[PDB]
Amino acid sequence: KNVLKIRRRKMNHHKYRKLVKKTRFLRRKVQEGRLRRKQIKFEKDLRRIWLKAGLKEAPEGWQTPKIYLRG
Amino acid sequence: LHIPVMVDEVVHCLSPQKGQIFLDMTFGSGGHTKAILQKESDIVLYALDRDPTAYALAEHLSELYPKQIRAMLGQFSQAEALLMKAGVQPGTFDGVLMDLGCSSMQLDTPERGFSLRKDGPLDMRMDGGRYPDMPTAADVVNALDQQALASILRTYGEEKHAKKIASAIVQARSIYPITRTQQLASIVAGAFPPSAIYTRKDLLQRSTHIATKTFQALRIFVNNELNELYTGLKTAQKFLRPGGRLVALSFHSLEDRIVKRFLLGISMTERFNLSVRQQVMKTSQLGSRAPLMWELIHKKVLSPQDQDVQDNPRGRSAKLRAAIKL
RNA sequence: AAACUCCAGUUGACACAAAAUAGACUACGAAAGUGGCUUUAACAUAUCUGAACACACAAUAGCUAAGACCCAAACUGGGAUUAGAUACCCCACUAUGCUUAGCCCUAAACCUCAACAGUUAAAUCAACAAAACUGCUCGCCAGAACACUACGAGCCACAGCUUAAAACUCAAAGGACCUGGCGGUGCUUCAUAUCCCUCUAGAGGAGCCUGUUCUGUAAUCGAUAAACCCCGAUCAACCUCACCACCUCUUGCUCAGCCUAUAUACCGCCAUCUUCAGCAAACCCUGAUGAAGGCUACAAAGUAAGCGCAAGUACCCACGUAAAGACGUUAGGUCAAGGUGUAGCCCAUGAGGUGGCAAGAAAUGGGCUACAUUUUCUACCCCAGAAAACUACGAUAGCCCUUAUGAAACUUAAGGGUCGAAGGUGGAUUUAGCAGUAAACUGAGAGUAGAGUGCUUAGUUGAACAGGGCCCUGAAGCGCGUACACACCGCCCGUCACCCUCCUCAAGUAUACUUCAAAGG
């Protein structure tokens, strides 16, 4: 058979890889900011829980971990 | 002002020294010829040009050095006869500096017709009326048929759109005579959509007019620079001393090939840009080069320094091919 | 070329690399994978189905760390080719391929066939692939493109993977097959005066003749690559004549006229392939009654007729040469042979008279005559004598004078005189010819009052070569591929600071909007 459908996908993937290459430093700064907000959004969800349960502070000895950092 | 292209290399390359006689087949403005009469005060030099205006400059500049520079006028083909009248048939010329292309003065003066940007008569002829019957670019475009004119553009201009740019010229000439540079430039642009006027780019990646390949094409067919270049090199060889350093300067591929294929013996009828794969395929069919007469001082073509290119963009494409006769 | 020259050859010693032959076998394993030898362990389930995410795996490439390193090798350096750079080629060498310990989790990971069970009778079946189906279950799909993308989420992944949209946009996108076209497509055999070489005489150089082009002119038209160019013309001093200038006529030689436009409305007569052998009907049969196809002679679905070829006829045979040569191709040629559709003129685009143009700065086609000794002149029609280089060969040209035709002749033709030029056998290229031909020479005819170096045609003398090939040219047969069909001068893809539509991200910054009391003392 022909390979015209494969060729369309080939070009799409090539241009995508080429776009990612050109903007890989901007995309890295954007990804970092998203992970920071993701961590903040997670921290708020846990604070909402203990606050809606009647507690005024986090459970004694509880520290919310950083679950989105590369480390 | 136009600094002589690669003057530092050409001076070192020829190493002009006392007791050596040199020739210059393209005096033009004389910047190179003067740079050579500065390093060695005891040098002997001969000049030549196709432009009588260039030959007058040499005559006026001969006052600076009475006999160290000898001015001559004529084409490369006519150079041997002109120099043969002097009687230096063996010549024993230590070096022949065959600078190529159009002179800075020739294309800086709009009257000469070489500049598309300015408005001058469509002469585009290095000859300065020394032969008043020599056809000018205006004559070439108004006479030749589409097939004939297209070949001029295709072979000499390296122009893909030879049929498209030639048809526009044929139609335009019928409406009115093509006699001015801007008139032609507009006709060539009219073969393409209006935006095409500056779509094309140079190797410098700066926009160029869409007719910069028709001004070069006609320039080389009016002045027969390519055929005259083959005889010019041959004549230099006959008049060049054994052990004498030749130095050429090729600003475009067509002239560069001839200098390459002459200093290396390669047949002029071979295919261009032959790859190693094609070379194997060519010789495999036959299965079923002569001794070189030169020693290339620098094996690979030199080129202008990138910093110097910006200062003198006209000379960006200057490819210097040096050789010693064998 | 560079590189190497503690290089190369023989011999011996010598691996953490890779595993000829067997293997023409088609086995093992869930898949990925697994083909040197040995040993140990060892290849789940006594109903089936059952996951993007649970569980465990998963080629190649890749990451992290530590080792090995023969060979290979992205990358890189050098050499070469190249107008030049990269690549293709050569040399050297690295990541990597290996081992170990962790990751990463992708493939055209494809028998492109989900697992299990059953059937071969029905209809065999859109097509192709891989004979057609039934039961049952899970997974998945619902126009193209956007999109292996965006956002969200998860992940040892950080230029990553998995899952996976919408807006704007379009009337298609797509699958299979057939035909055609095309292929820098395969093989095969070819052209017979031919594609090339080979044979003979030429053209291309000179002058002249003649056509065309260009230019010129107040002054036609048509033909105009093959298939125009001594072509319509077997023919222009007036006439012819359709052209130009001037003058004249108006029911006009005609129950008017128009050589006005349109050959891209036509008839008529033709060019061209054709130096072809095919074309168009009436039937029949195959393919499930799809587009399509239809031959095997020890014959298997084709056939009774028409046109062309063929036959026959003309010329001197049955040979040859003529003639013939369909359909179709080039909207080929001709409205100016005549006729004619349509449109236009009618005091003028019609009709008549007078005079006039029909040239050459040139370029080019065809022809003629030459450049001579196989010749030149004379006699003769083949046993001769002279000529034979600046008084030779060579004008059919120029000039001058006669004659012929005509009312009209510097002009047309013939003859004489004078003149004695270029030319010294012609580059690329190119034409014709297979035998009574080419070549050479001689006569006649058509048409005119006269007029061609043109045309048609009769005769005379009379050769050489005919083999060998397939780059180019074109042809045929049997194939292969095809995203082209406006048919490769095709089509599509990427690219670009022109444009509008839509979407996403995003710094900080405010802006409203939602939530609390669905509580406690």
Ligand SMILES: Nc1ncnc2c1ncn2[C@@H]1O[C@H](CSCC[C@H](N)C(=O)O)[C@@H](O)[C@H]1O
């Ligand atoms: N065939 C030829 N014979 C002689 N001179 C030629 C020529 N083709 C070109 N030329 C001349 O050579 C020169 C080349 S360009 C000028 C270069 C000169 N050395 C200078 O002083 O700048 C021009 O003057 C040009 O007119």
Ligand SMILES: [K+]
């Ligand atoms: K083995």
Ligand SMILES: [K+]
């Ligand atoms: K094997």
Ligand SMILES: [K+]
């Ligand atoms: K497969």
Ligand SMILES: [K+]
């Ligand atoms: K085909």
Ligand SMILES: [K+]
């Ligand atoms: K000739």
Ligand SMILES: [K+]
């Ligand atoms: K016709």
Ligand SMILES: [K+]
């Ligand atoms: K007619």
Ligand SMILES: [K+]
């Ligand atoms: K008509």
Ligand SMILES: [K+]
């Ligand atoms: K001729």
Ligand SMILES: [Mg+2]
């Ligand atoms: Mg795309």
Ligand SMILES: [Mg+2]
């Ligand atoms: Mg070496």
Ligand SMILES: [Mg+2]
């Ligand atoms: Mg199961």
Ligand SMILES: [Mg+2]
């Ligand atoms: Mg599921």
Ligand SMILES: [Mg+2]
């Ligand atoms: Mg599964």
Ligand SMILES: [Mg+2]
């Ligand atoms: Mg998966």
